[PDB]
Design a protein around this ligand. Structure first.
Ligand SMILES: Nc1ncnc2c1ncn2[C@@H]1O[C@H](COP(=O)(O)OP(=O)(O)CP(=O)(O)O)[C@@H](O)[C@H]1O
Ligand code: NA
Ligand code: NA
Lengths: 214, 929, 298, 139
């Protein structure tokens, strides 16, 4: 009848103990192995309802809202009041760290100027996958082509990290309105930062389809 | 178109053979070379690789071809529609092709292994033929019979080829092969009918000579013969068929439910179809029937090196459910190697001994009664010395014939000597062969004496059946009338000599009067005219037939195993009871009603039969016993001896035993024992001294004619029911590790621990585990101490086996695979607390920022290389863990950071392998763990 | 008991014959196993009460392997010990020195192999054979490797004890194991004992096959004598004797798988072995006046 | 067991005549008897307790050594039920037997349990006497 209750109930005790022993030989700031994620792929924010296809109507507040509150919530820690407690790292450098306490740099939200949905020039943020370590190579630059207008040590150590964002503004002028704009962003000017794969269409390149309903 | 119309001289002309010695070996070899083997009958068979086509097809193996063809069609459509097609559907088709190819190779090997042994069993007992070659009686293999041989067929003998009968001493053949009639048709050397199929001078191939003797010239051997020119459920198999059906139903239910849930969970149509066909063809118990056949064939091979040749695999499992053995004394329970101990010609125990010198104890040819008895014994015997081993001692010699006859011949040679010359002096006129129905054998000879009446009568047989036809005696060479003063002494001699388990044969002779039987009197076997009654008794003969050396131990094993041993014998109720006590059939304690009527003095009619647990039943009392009267004997008595019983009453005995719900094994070595051999659940024939008819009627052949070999076969077949469950509980263990990944997937919303290709790869590596679990088996120390298995109540598969196999040895292999999955996902960053609710974003191809627990962000195609690593690790870990578990179990009882692999799935085994030892659930399930 | 030392062109065999009288009648010749003498193997069997009805009619000759006797000097360092097949060549001169014309053999383990090889070489000097725990086959390759491994890890006494006795009786029967431990370790010379063990391990193969009726009339190769194969139900040598049950003519060969029995059936079940031996001997024309056991008991 | 001492038919008399102060408790057994196998562990755990210097435990196989079965009047026939036999040897001479042999020469049936050995052989008092006397030998 209920004989399995005692058997299964205490069967998990060995399973839990073996899980516990495994969890105490790991760190909390670095994975044991990390070769599957050797280079960082790219991604577009906000994440559409469909396969990276943005679709909003300019004559509607709710149509472009689902992206506006997403961008506002995501870009909240980047604001001026929430970046005043980080050291300003030199521009163009390769800032490293070795101290027992790690602190990230400052990323001002004023970098991503101009979110243009109502104006007719929607702004979507193209991010970069975070990899623990993996210092970038050459001149990292996100090249986005359709007028397209472009503008780590761990979650525990590098606390306060603010990754470099790139904001892509695809203008919808009256002469070209209602089209399905397909932009092709890609990392350029780098060697470690891979950009060519067959099955992995996102390792370096992200392709989104922005469309405004006239 | 035969030679039944030819003359005796014409047979010599046509075939070039002398009809007194046959064609000699010099031409026999040439004729064998020219025409080939006697029994050709070549059947056509499969070209072998055609069977491979059936192995790589059919059953549930065609679902994988359906899946592979669907995958290839979808690949073709995708390649035609979209440029740069995804090389995944082609790989999917290739994998489900190679899986079936490998599984079919496994099945073909596993079936050829069984077929090799099963065909090996058919050559241990070849068909034999007695041909007269070089003027001597030899026994060639039946395939060497040559057109023109001289073949002699006795009773219960398969006829080797088409014979034209030239001599026949009352021969009747069973022609049911070409007709439907089973009545024995008489055969004579005389032309009877124009049709060769209805004449009396032709005996056909494959028929049986059910009575008598004959001799013929082979006319058609291979395919020119009339036979060569013209061309089922058991409880164990039924149980394993019903179980496979219900488990297949469960498999289809689970596969359909999983396919529906996959469609609900946003699966691809082809992916979900392949998942359903990988679940169905992984949960079905394919190979269970092959494993069962492997077990049966292996254990039939094991009990053939112990002289128990089974003629089919259905007798392998019946031998093991046995609860009654009806055995025959002479040959089976006794060695049939007979030596003389005491003599009875006078009213005294006349001892005898070996070591010819000093005459053996103290006695010689002084007594004329002894002289007459010796002459009678020498003349009545048909056994003769083999013409070899002359320098060997008389006792250490080769004699062909009946064992009692051989002992008598050796005795006469040791005492008087030159029994061949003694028989030459007394030329035999007529001979009446011994029959199990007549219980006697007589002969008439010619007397070269002085006061002889010109005719001599010689008789031997059952002592009490001989005294009943004797009116005179011979004491010290003088004839006296028969009275009680000698009858009490004769019965006392039978009681003392027969009470020692010594076989006594009554010999008697009557001087045939000359005035009634002249020199040329008519002497015919049929319608006897000689005075069978009123003979002169010249004494009995007491010799030993010791029990077989391993038979008392076998009776002890039967007694401890709950098997009833019944002795059916034709000997006296005195000798039979003595032998039953000497072999242990009637054990100490239990006494016959005649024993408890003499331990305390009352008449036997005043004794309650319920006080006696042993009885000796005379065969003449069983002939007037109803079915309800034999029932009161077989169930109220634990030890039954049927003495003075003909071979035709063994049918009544086995029928009465079977009316009690027993599984009867019966022993037979004659044509008259065939209905008993065909009625019994197991029919046992004798491989040394047994008819070709009994060897056909039987389901088993005793290569040594030993009762101990039957018990050894029962002991070996008892080990089938505990090895079949180790296979039904090992084909089922792997199912839970195959279906728990998807259940946990659905419930806990975690990345998939195991995929369809790896699901179909798991059941490949774990497919031969039950097969190798039976070649490395062991034997229990109490297999022969248990009561017989009830085949109608004892079930191979029960809830206590299915529940154990699934919920105790599959839920602990599933955890050992889940450990490898969790760890391979943990070393890469994802912690088990994070891996919960992740399957919605883990499986989203357009969410390429899935947050690692250590802060990293993974692309879809980077997550689905760790996922496939987890799948492959799951498969390999489960397979290697099952193999190592097999080795550890049948060894113990009856590297770089790789602690998460096979290590834990063997560690989790250790805990329940040990903790379960504490429960000791009695109604025991700690044999497996 | 008369003890003889016989020079035998391969060493010297020590034989102890009890019941000296002989004639045209066979004697009983016994050969022991590894770790034993004739005393450690057959001295509580021929002293058994039921056995005394068979030893008044037969002479018993007890054969010791060269050097595996009582009070045996150590063999020289690296002495060339005779093979299992040279041990069976020492028996015909034993028979001629004692004026024996024929024997009935009882052998245990290695003695069964030696007596079987002797009966194969000279079938005219043997009438019957009681073979106990007989291994007709070579050790093999996996077993050879395991022996080479256990030779250094385990003591010779424990090796021999595991050879003789099964796993269950190595723990249950306290006084049997504690008796034969002293028997092996204190009554045998330990250099000659390892010599005998080495010669038995590389024992070659008994060339015997079961005669097939008819076709196999070409040459055949088997024992032409009444064989009684004896093994216990719980002995480590069950499979070896069952392999020896095949490759032997079933016409004259008997297999006794004794129940409730272990490694050495002649010392733990001598009553059940005496009865089988008596019936085996009576089947060949000996002691015909001996009453059937379990009949004279009642 | 290194506490029970197994005897031959030479050594038993040697070690019974070696010391006259010592009490010897010797079991006469045979490897074919099934009763001696049942009494085998009981004797072992009795010697595990009462093994003082003045009281040692012995054993002898009378199934193999038939010269002990005669000098100590222990019947090896299986129809006598004399096996196992427990004999006490106070002062080198027999002081008590189990099972006891009556006038006719038939052994009275006796149950060889642990609780029947200490009581009838006075093992609890032999232990105390021997352990009290042994301290005088070292003084
Ligand atoms: N050659 C022979 N001539 C005459 N009588 C014979 C005989 N061989 C056997 N008998 C007698 O025939 C009787 C019955 O023989 P039957 O063949 O029916 O059973 P059986 O004696 O062979 C013992 P079992 O039935 O156990 O094999 C016995 O009394 C026996 O002495
Ligand atoms: Na399957
Ligand atoms: Na399975």
């Amino acid at each position: 009848l209920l004989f399995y209750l005692v058997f299964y109930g205490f069967l998990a005790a060995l399973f839990s103990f073996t899980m516990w022993v495994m969890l105490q030989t790991l760190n909390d700031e670095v994975p044991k192995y990390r070769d599957q994620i050797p280079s960082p792929g790219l991604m577009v924010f906000p994440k559409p309802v469909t396969a990276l296809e943005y679709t909003f109507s300019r004559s509607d507040p709710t149509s472009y809202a689902g992206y506006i509150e997403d961008l506002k919530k995501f870009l909240k820690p980047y604001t001026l009041e929430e970046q005043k407690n980080l050291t300003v790292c030199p521009d163009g450098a390769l800032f490293e760290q070795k101290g027992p306490v790690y602190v990230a740099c400052q990323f001002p939200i004023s970098l991503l100027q101009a979110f243009g949905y109502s104006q007719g020039n929607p702004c979507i943020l193209v991010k970069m996958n975070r990899i623990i370590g993996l210092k970038p190579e050459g001149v990292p630059r996100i090249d986005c082509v359709s007028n397209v207008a472009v503008y780590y040590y761990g979650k525990k150590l590098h606390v306060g990290y603010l990754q470099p964002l790139v904001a892509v503004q695809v203008s919808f002028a009256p002469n070209n309105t209602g089209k399905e704009v397909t932009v092709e962003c890609k990392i350029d000017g780098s060697a470690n930062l891979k950009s060519q794969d067959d099955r992995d269409k996102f390792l370096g390149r992200v392709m989104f389809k922005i469309t405004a309903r006239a | 178109m035969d030679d039944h119309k030819l003359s005796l001289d014409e047979l010599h002309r046509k075939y070039g053979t002398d009809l007194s010695r046959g064609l000699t070996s010099a031409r026999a070899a040439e004729i064998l070379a020219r025409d080939g083997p006697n029994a050709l009958t070549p059947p056509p068979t499969t070209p072998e690789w055609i069977k491979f086509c059936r192995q790589l097809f059919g059953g549930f193996s065609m679902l994988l071809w359906i899946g592979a063809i669907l995958c290839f069609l979808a690949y073709s459509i995708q390649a035609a529609t979209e440029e740069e097609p995804q090389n995944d559907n082609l790989y999917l088709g290739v994998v489900l092709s190679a899986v079936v190819i490998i599984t079919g190779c496994f099945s073909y090997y596993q079936e050829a292994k069984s077929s090799k042994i099963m065909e090996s069993f058919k050559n241990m007992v070849p068909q034999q033929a007695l041909v007269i070659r070089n003027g001597e009686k030899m026994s060639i293999n039946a395939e060497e019979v040559v057109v023109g041989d001289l073949v002699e067929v006795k009773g219960g003998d398969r006829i080797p080829a088409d014979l034209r009968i030239i001599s026949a001493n009352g021969c009747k053949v069973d022609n049911s092969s070409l007709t439907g009639e089973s009545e024995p048709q008489t055969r004579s050397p005389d032309f009877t009918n124009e049709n060769p199929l209805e004449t009396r001078n032709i005996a056909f191939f494959s028929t049986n000579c059910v009575e008598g003797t004959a001799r013929g010239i082979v006319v058609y051997t291979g395919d020119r013969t009339v036979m060569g020119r013209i061309a089922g459920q058991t409880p164990i198999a039924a149980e394993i068929e019903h179980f496979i059906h219900i488990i297949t139903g469960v498999a289809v239910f689970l596969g359909v439910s999983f396919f529906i849930l996959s469609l609900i969970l946003e699966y691809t149509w082809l992916e979900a179809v392949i998942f359903l066909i990988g679940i169905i063809v992984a949960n079905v118990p394919e190979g269970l029937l092959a494993t069962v056949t492997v077990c049966l064939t292996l254990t039939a091979k094991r009990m053939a090196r112990k002289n128990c040749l089974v003629k089919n695999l259905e007798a392998v499992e019946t031998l093991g459910s046995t609860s009654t053995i009806c055995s025959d004394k002479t040959g089976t329970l006794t060695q049939n190697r007979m030596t003389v101990a005491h003599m009875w010609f006078d009213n005294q125990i006349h001892e005898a001994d070996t070591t010819e010198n000093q005459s053996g104890v103290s006695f010689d040819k002084t007594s004329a009664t002894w002289l007459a008895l010796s002459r009678i014994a020498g003349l009545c015997n048909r056994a003769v010395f083999q013409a070899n081993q002359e320098n060997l001692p008389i006792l250490k010699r080769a004699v062909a014939g009946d064992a009692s006859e051989s002992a008598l011949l050796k005795c006469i040679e040791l005492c008087c000597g030159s029994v061949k010359e003694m028989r030459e002096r007394y030329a035999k006129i007529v001979e009446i062969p011994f029959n199990s129905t007549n219980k006697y054998q007589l002969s008439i000879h010619k007397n070269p004496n002085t006061s002889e009446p010109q005719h001599l009568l010689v008789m031997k047989g059952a002592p009490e059946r001989i005294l009943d036809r004797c009116s005179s005696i011979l004491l010290h060479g003088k004839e006296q009338p028969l009275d009680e003063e000698l009858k009490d002494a004769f019965q006392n001699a039978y009681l003392e000599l027969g009470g020692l388990g010594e076989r006594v044969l009554g010999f008697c002779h009557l001087f045939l009067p000359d005035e009634q039987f002249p020199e040329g009197f008519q002497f015919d076997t049929d319608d006897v005219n000689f005075p069978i009654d009123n003979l002169c008794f010249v004494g009995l003969i007491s010799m030993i037939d010791p029990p077989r050396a391993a038979v008392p131990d076998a009776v002890g094993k039967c007694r401890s195993a709950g098997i009833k041993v019944i002795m059916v014998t034709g000997d006296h109720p005195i000798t039979a009871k003595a032998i039953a006590k000497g072999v242990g059939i009637i054990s100490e304690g239990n006494e016959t009603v005649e024993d408890i009527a003499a331990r305390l003095n009352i008449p036997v009619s005043q004794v309650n039969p319920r006080d006696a647990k042993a009885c000796v039943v005379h065969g003449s009392d069983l002939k007037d016993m109803t079915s309800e009267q034999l029932d009161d004997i077989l169930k109220y008595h634990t030890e039954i001896v049927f003495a003075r019983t003909s071979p035709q009453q063994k049918l009544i005995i086995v029928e009465g035993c079977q009316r009690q719900g027993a599984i009867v094994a019966v022993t037979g070595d004659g044509v008259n024992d065939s209905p008993a051999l065909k009625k019994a659940d197991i029919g046992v024939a004798m491989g040394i001294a047994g008819s070709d008819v009994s060897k056909q009627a039987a389901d088993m052949i005793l290569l040594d004619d030993n009762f101990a070999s039957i018990v050894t076969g029962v002991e070996e077949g008892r080990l089938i029911f505990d090895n079949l469950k180790k296979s039904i509980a090992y084909t089922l263990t792997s199912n839970i590790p195959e279906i728990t990944p998807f259940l946990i997937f659905i419930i806990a919303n975690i990345p998939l621990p195991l995929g369809t290709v790896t699901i179909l790869c798991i059941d490949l590596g774990t497919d031969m585990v039950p097969a190798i679990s039976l070649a490395y088996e062991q034997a229990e120390s109490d297999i022969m101490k248990r009561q017989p298995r009830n085949p109608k109540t004892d079930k191979l598969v029960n809830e206590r086996l299915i529940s154990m196999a699934y919920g105790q040895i599959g839920m602990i292999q599933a955890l050992g695979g889940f450990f490898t999955y969790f760890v391979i996902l943990a070393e890469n960053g994802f912690l088990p607390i994070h891996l919960l609710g992740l399957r919605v974003d883990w499986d989203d191809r357009w969410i390429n920022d899935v947050e690692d627990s250590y802060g990293q962000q993974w692309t879809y195609e980077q997550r689905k290389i760790v996922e496939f690593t987890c799948h492959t690790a799951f498969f390999v870990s489960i397979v290697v863990v099952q193999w190592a578990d097999l080795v550890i179990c049948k060894t113990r009882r009856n590297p770089t950071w790789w602690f998460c692999a096979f290590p834990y799935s063997l560690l989790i085994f250790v805990y329940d392998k040990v903790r379960k030892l504490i429960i000791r659930r009695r109604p025991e399930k700690e044999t497996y763990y | 008991c008369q003890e003889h030392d016989i020079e035998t062109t391969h060493g010297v065999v020590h034989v102890t014959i009890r019941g000296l009288p002989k004639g045209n009648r066979p004697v009983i010749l016994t050969y022991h196993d590894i770790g034993l003498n004739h005393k450690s193997c057959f001295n509580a069997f021929f002293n058994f009460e039921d056995m005394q009805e068979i030893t008044q009619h037969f002479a018993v000759c007890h054969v010791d392997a060269p050097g595996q006797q009582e009070g045996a000097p150590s063999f020289p360092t690296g002495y060339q010990y005779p093979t299992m097949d040279e041990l069976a060549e020492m028996l015909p001169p034993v028979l001629t020195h004692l004026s024996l014309k024929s024997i009935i053999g009882i052998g245990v383990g290695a003695g069964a192999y030696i007596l079987s090889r002797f009966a194969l070489n000279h079938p005219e000097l043997v009438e019957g054979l009681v073979l106990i725990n007989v291994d007709p086959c070579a050790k093999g390759w996996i077993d050879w490797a395991a022996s080479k491994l256990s030779g250094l890890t385990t003591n010779v006494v424990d090796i021999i004890l595991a050879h003789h006795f099964g796993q269950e009786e190595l723990q249950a029967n306290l006084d049997l194991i504690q008796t034969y431990r002293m028997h092996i370790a204190q009554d045998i010379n330990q250099d000659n004992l390892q010599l005998f063990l080495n010669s038995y391990n590389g024992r070659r193969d008994l060339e015997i096959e079961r005669p097939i009726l008819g076709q196999n009339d070409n040459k055949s190769k088997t024992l032409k004598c009444s064989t009684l194969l004896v093994v216990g139900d719980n002995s480590p040598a069950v499979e070896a004797v069952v392999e020896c049950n095949s490759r032997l003519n079933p016409i004259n060969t008997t297999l006794l798988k004794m129940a409730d029995c272990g490694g050495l059936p002649q010392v733990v079940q001598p009553g059940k072995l005496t009865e089988a031996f008596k019936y085996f001997l009576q089947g060949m024309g000996y002691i015909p006046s001996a009453s059937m056991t379990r009949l004279a008991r009642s | 067991p290194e506490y029970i001492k197994y005897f031959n038919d030479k050594t038993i008399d040697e070690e019974l005549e070696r010391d006259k102060r010592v009490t010897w408790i010797v079991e006469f057994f045979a490897n074919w008897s099934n009763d001696c196998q049942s009494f085998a562990p009981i004797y072992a755990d009795l010697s595990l307790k009462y093994n003082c210097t003045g009281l040692n435990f012995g054993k002898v196989d009378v199934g193999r050594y038939t010269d002990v079965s005669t000098r100590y009047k222990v019947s090896t026939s299986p129809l006598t039920k004399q096996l196992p036999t427990l004999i006490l040897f106070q002062g080198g001479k027999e002081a008590m037997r189990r099972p006891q042999i009556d006038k006719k020469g038939r052994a009275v049936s006796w149950t060889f349990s642990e609780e029947n050995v200490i009581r009838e052989f006075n093992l609890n008092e032999l232990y105390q006497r021997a352990k009290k006397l042994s301290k005088a030998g070292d003084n």
